[PDB]
Design a protein around this ligand. Structure first.
Ligand SMILES: Cc1c([C@@H](C2=C(O)[C@@H](Cc3ccccc3)OC2=O)c2ccccc2)[nH]c2ccc(F)cc12
Ligand SMILES: [Cl-]
Ligand SMILES: [Cl-]
Ligand SMILES: [Cl-]
Ligand SMILES: [Zn+2]
Length: 226
């Protein structure tokens, strides 16, 4: 998160810190969010050979009793996910066991309503990602308030599509999600409307988020079948 503030510790108890293992390079990092006691929603490009989920974190370098380090049994990448266009950058992680509910760990279930969110309002995104182009990921959970933009603001992302994705972050500000934040939720009025997907390598906003409303049927399908 660039240009944000440190979150109040444990104030976003659904936040998940993902460490992504691959057979041929070191760990990579993403965010995600707990939507059922045994399911974390994140981005498909965060898939790997294996993934560890840490719930209950604030400062990820300091182990504490609120931590729940949970095994992932299976990754459910969207079946139409495209590694070239980044369309359908959404994935569900099934946890081996159900998380414990604590003050610091809880789910963020969707409301029944799945209305299309138009441009204009302010939303918030949180993550442990990089706080600048030349900076490491934040030790502490950070968050930032970002403007939902008209889709034309993301036209330069030639594979952006308004029906599938939200365009997030006024280009007049430095505020943005960035590397390490992928998979985290964008909340608008306390409801998860987006998932951090991708943006420019130089962190200039806007960035592209998966539009959750479009994927509600698929999410429901996976959750009912597993
Ligand atoms: C440039 C960018 C990214 C890319 C990225 C990650 O997600 C992490 C972990 C990782 C690394 C390598 C491979 C997979 C994951 O390191 C990265 O370099 C990325 C990689 C791949 C696809 C799509 C985006 N995420 C963003 C989020 C918001 C934003 F404004 C810009 C970006
Ligand atoms: Cl802010
Ligand atoms: Cl570009
Ligand atoms: Cl919020
Ligand atoms: Zn704590």
């Amino acid at each position: 998160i660039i240009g944000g503030t440190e979150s109040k510790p444990h104030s976003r108890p659904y936040m998940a810190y993902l460490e992504i293992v691959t057979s041929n390079g070191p760990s990579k990092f993403c965010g995600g969010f707990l939507i059922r006691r045994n399911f974390v929603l994140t981005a498909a490009h965060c898939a790997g050979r294996s993934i560890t989920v840490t719930l209950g974190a604030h400062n990820i370098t300091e182990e504490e009793d609120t931590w729940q380090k949970l095994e992932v049994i299976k990754q459910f990448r969207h079946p139409k996910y495209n590694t070239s266009t980044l369309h359908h950058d959404i994935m569900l992680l099934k946890l081996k066991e159900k998380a414990s509910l604590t003050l610091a760990v809880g789910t963020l279930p969707f409301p029944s309503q799945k209305n299309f969110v138009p441009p204009g309002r302010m939303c918030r995104v949180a993550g442990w990602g990089r706080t600048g182009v030349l900076k490491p990921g934040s030790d502490t959970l950070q968050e930032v308030k970002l403007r939902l933009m008209d889709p034309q603001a993301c036209s330069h992302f030639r594979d952006f599509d308004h029906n599938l994705q939200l365009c997030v972050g006024n280009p007049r500000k430095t505020k943005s999600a960035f590397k390490g934040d992928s998979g985290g939720p964008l909340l608008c009025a306390g409801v998860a409307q987006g998932i951090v997907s991708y943006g420019r390598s130089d962190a200039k906003p806007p960035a592209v988020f998966t539009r959750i409303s479009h994927y509600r049927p698929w999410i429901n399908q996976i959750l009912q079948a597993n």
